[PDB]
Design a protein around this nucleic acid. Structure first.
Length: 77
DNA sequence: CCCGCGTTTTAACCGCCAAGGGGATTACTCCCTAGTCTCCTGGCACGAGACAGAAAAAAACAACGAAAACGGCCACCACCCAGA
């Protein structure tokens, strides 16, 4: 069950790292501050590195309890 | 109408997990309250005077209790209709 729940994350990780590393803003949310800075202020946004390395790192953070089980949900959302 | 007993359904209860609001505490600092001296004027005691109200007597009226009249219901008689 764990292996099957991580294989999909692997494939989607290739594709989704490709995606996330090119998440464009538009023009007018920044001038008027219309984007969600919440997942960035506490560094849960997946910008900067792999997806099948931040999912596992976040899982570790969650098991140790350092990461809320609610914010992990949004970050994976 | 409410108690009693019985199926049938509902949700209370337990227990377990996850999250965080807010109780509780600590440390810093200041602004508010206690305290005190001097000043005085508001509140109290005393005196007074007069009018609001108690009283009162008398009249008006406004609640309590009998016989006649009117209306309604029941019984009896008369008239009309239906049946034998």
């Amino acid at each position: 069950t764990i292996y099957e729940r991580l294989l999909e994350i692997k494939q989607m990780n290739e594709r989704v790292t490709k995606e996330i590393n090119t998440r464009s803003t538009v023009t007018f949310a920044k001038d008027l501050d219309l984007l969600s800075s919440q997942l960035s202020e506490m560094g849960l946004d997946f910008v900067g590195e792999d997806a099948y390395k931040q999912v596992l790192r976040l899982s570790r953070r969650l098991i140790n309890g350092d990461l809320e089980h609610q914010w992990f949900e949004e970050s994976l959302r």
